[PDB]
Symmetry: C3
């Protein structure tokens, strides 16, 4: 059974095929690839673009999406095995996934980490459990990686540069400020796809404490050694931005401070200058800027940067619809 | 770009065309005016009729509605310009409207005032922001006016009297009781459409403090001088109801007490007799009664009045579906 | 006007026809029985299977389901007659049902008892009110009985035994543990359909305090005297399970302790051994086990029992989709 849990699990040929079908769907939006079929969109956290794009995608391909929110409308779910369910959870994922599998043709799941202990969050328990127990394909709508965002992002880049081959371009994945510590998911994904596409990647972040999990630093290393690109970690703003072709910002809490954010607060607060403004973007080679959204203006990026003709965030956002339809079509 | 923010922005010819198409859709409900198209229904407050009627309307015309609730499922939105987003809001309407505009063909928005300061609520910031930043038509699903309700109401009246020409009829817009101070939106809208239709309008309310915002009193004045009707403010029940052809009730907090409801509580509480009962309706010329709903029985109107054959509230409620389909068809 | 409030209200011929159409829909899922039609699914409590199955069912038959949650998105509703609505409820069911009746073709309603006073919960006020005021057919999505579950369950049994005639088989409806007192709805329904199908039924429960409401014990008595089966109440585990062909578990709070659960807590807590495990199921005649779900593993039933090839709960869950489509088709 083929799932869409991570682009890393797919071959470059399969990913290229997805992106191409995405471009094709962008040209002809209505189709019958999902006629009479349905997808259950399970959300354990908030969403605007993901819920909307998947729901419309199913509709445009002749299918139907059922939106579920455990703890809100659906019953809370237990994932640990062999435990006595006398707590807050009403049913086990074993039953949930099997039941849904009798109703729908695809299952999407969004579940952010709990931020109490990275040792447990990094195991990707919710996603793996759905994939384990579901008799139908499972799609990652963001857990500790955000693969649908990776493809929307990659397509937007290929569209901007007018070619599927991004090798050569200097890609800068920069950390940015936010009053709260966030998920590293989008950053892990950006690092993964940027290297898989063979670009010259630079992970710009405040201090070594903000370096991503080894799992992704290693995926990136293997991707580079096979794509022809390169990976580099930096803590100097100006040097990183210089000559860049692409700048992708994202904020995230330092992994070493999981379950202990009290001391990390003052640390991030002294790096508010990592905000993407005109000054930094001027150091790039007429490079493009993007963010996965939602974005806090004048915090993560300035109004000027967001309204700049070089900001392709809205195009990347649109592409979420096209890439997802390609993913659903490929899995059914 | 044409939007449906207020009937006042539309010409009488355009409004007559909408009402006619509404009547046509009421005769033939299934159509293809929205085939493959979609509308994002953004709700910042509760709704039963609006969400249901729009959702079914999109379905019946071959399209699909995506229901969103910022703060509930979708991310909270910021509307103020050039501010530092380090508060409760995650993204700016600038991005929200542009992203949705890449997904859907129409955007509906419902956003009640905050009731903290009428000076800010009356600016209609949420609605204006969507219309400003959206690349697709925007529809007012109720903010400080309720135009979809105006047309459902007008159509119901034309159906009751068997003619589109309502000139001559005596229309009474009466305030009614409610334990809490409410939005003036429906009252502002009733005053607007009743005069636009050229009826003899009387705004019956407890005291001068309950008179509506000058903006709408002025719209009404201009509507009368062009429709042939008339406007009048009254504080005497019996005289107002006498010979009336239509009685539309609605409760609302006195504008002069915005952000300071403590002292207004005892004021409204001494006017519970403004409730629409058999006695008052008997003073009318076999007139009809209606309310936008939801209605608190034995508080706003008595059970007898609600179950009276002269109460057309259910018909007006149904018309919300037909008028809205006419609006969506006209905007696409 | 025909509604689907309880299987008891339907003749055996009509129920047999529903089950047959259910089997037919299971063979050919896409149809046009609800083309252009819609159903309003009103939920006053949580749901995963019910919301999903009804929503997909409407879609597969060419219709559309509108999901509503009073108090969450829709306005709170009042059901008592002739009262002054100055409390938490915004509108009366009289208006709600009539308005929905102008929009949709069917109305489903789920409303659990309040658990404050069985004397009032047993009156089934919400369901009866919808059926009273709605101009369109009403469907019970679970209140104090769960008829859609009854048919999904019955069909699963007929499929397992390879015949619609279940007479002769020994059916055991056993109470099970749960940290909290639950609704008796599913148990009342199981007792009702098991006897209506003419099986040898045994209601196994801890003490006489856990016996179901007389209303259902009486329905069962009348069903037996007409179906040829038999009814029996038991408090001895091993004797009940011995030679059973079917074992259906469900937990519920003792009716005599409604509104006074404090003292019942220690009572249920001393019967945790009523859990359905391998030991008990081994006493059966290679019998099948099922539960309506959601189920707490290692509390209501053990992991071994749930993963046993004799557990048909997933099949019963799937059947909810098929039986419901048969119900909607029959009512339109
Ligand atoms: C697109 C994912 C956004 C989510 N953002 C927040 C602010 O929680 C995150 O950081 O993963
Ligand atoms: C149809 C709009 C109803 C809303 N009512 C309440 C009670 O908030 C209002 O007064 O504007
Ligand atoms: C299928 C109905 C399940 C509901 N369960 C809970 C746990 O509330 C009940 O006991 O009625």
């Amino acid at each position: 059974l083929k799932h869409f849990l991570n682009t890393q699990d797919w071959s470059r040929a399969e990913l290229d095929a997805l992106l191409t079908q995405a471009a094709l769907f962008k040209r002809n939006k209505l189709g019958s690839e999902l006629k009479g079929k349905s997808i259950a969109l399970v959300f354990f956290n908030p969403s605007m673009r993901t819920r909307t794009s998947f729901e419309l995608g199913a509709f445009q391909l002749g299918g139907h999406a059922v939106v579920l929110q455990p703890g809100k409308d659906a019953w809370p779910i237990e994932f640990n095995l062999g435990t006595v369910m006398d707590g807050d959870t009403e049913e086990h994922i074993a039953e949930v996934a099997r039941v849904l599998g009798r109703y729908v043709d695809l299952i999407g799941v969004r579940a952010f980490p709990k931020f109490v202990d990275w040792s447990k969050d990094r195991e990707d328990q919710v996603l793996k459990s759905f994939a384990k127990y579901s008799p139908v394909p499972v799609i990652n709508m963001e857990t500790i990686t955000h693969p649908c965002q990776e493809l929307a992002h990659a397509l937007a880049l290929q569209e901007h540069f007018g070619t599927p081959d991004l090798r050569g371009k200097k890609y800068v994945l920069t950390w940015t400020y936010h009053p709260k510590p966030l998920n590293t998911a989008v950053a892990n994904s950006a690092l993964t796809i940027a290297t898989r596409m063979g670009m010259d990647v630079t992970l710009l972040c405040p201090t070594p404490d903000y370096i991503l999990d080894e799992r992704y630093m290693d995926w990136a290393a293997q991707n580079v050694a096979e794509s022809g690109g390169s990976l580099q970690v930096s803590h100097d703003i100006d040097s990183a931005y210089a000559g860049a072709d692409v700048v992708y910002a994202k904020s995230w809490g330092a992994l070493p401070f999981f379950g202990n954010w009290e001391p990390e607060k003052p640390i991030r607060d002294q790096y508010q200058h990592f905000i993407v403004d005109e000054r930094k973007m001027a150091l790039t080679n007429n490079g493009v800027f993007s963010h996965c959204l939602p974005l806090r203006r004048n915090v993560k990026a300035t109004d000027a940067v967001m309204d700049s003709p070089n900001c392709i965030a809205i195009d990347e956002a649109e592409n979420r619809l096209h890439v997802q339809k390609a993913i659903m079509a490929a899995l059914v």
